[PDB]
């Protein structure tokens, strides 16, 4: 539930609780956001955060 | 009781121990003053007031 919460928060979705397994829409949105950040419409995250 | 080397203060930038020494000397001064007023057994009133 935490993993899903963080995953949906990173992709700006209102929905908090998901199904554990990766729906393929997830992967597609992931690649969309990756190419977005590669274009420059986003900030890179640091793994230092608390 | 203890004789401490002064050359440890300025290069070790921990100056808090010096203020600690001062405030502690003042606290024991109060304690002495109360011990003195009790050894003479002045009166409840005077000890209470002080």
């Amino acid at each position: 539930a935490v993993g899903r919460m963080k995953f949906n928060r990173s992709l700006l979705r209102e929905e908090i609780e998901g199904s554990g397994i990766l729906s393929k829409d997830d992967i597609i949105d992931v690649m969309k956001k990756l190419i977005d950040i590669r274009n420059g419409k986003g900030e890179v995250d640091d793994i230092d955060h608390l | 009781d203890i004789v401490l080397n002064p050359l440890g203060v300025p290069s070790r930038m921990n100056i808090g121990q010096i203020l600690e020494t001062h405030l502690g000397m003042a606290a024991k001064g109060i304690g002495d003053k109360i011990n003195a007023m009790l050894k003479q057994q002045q009166e409840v009133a005077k000890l209470r007031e002080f």
Binding site: - | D1, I2, V3, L4, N5, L7, G8, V9, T21, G24
Partner: protein, 49 residues
């Protein structure tokens, strides 16, 4: 721990470095005497002899 009367000054280089000089008065009163409870075990096994 405990609170002692300290004086900041060099006393014939016995506190040369971070070392500390202490007066017999503290040991006399036994105010830094610790109790340590150590355990010892003697085990008697059975050898083939």
């Amino acid at each position: 721990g405990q609170n002692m009367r300290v004086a900041f000054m060099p006393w014939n280089g016995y506190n040369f470095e971070d070392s500390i000089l202490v007066s017999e008065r503290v040991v006399q009163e036994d105010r830094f005497t610790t109790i340590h409870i150590q355990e010892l075990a003697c085990v008697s096994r059975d050898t083939k002899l």
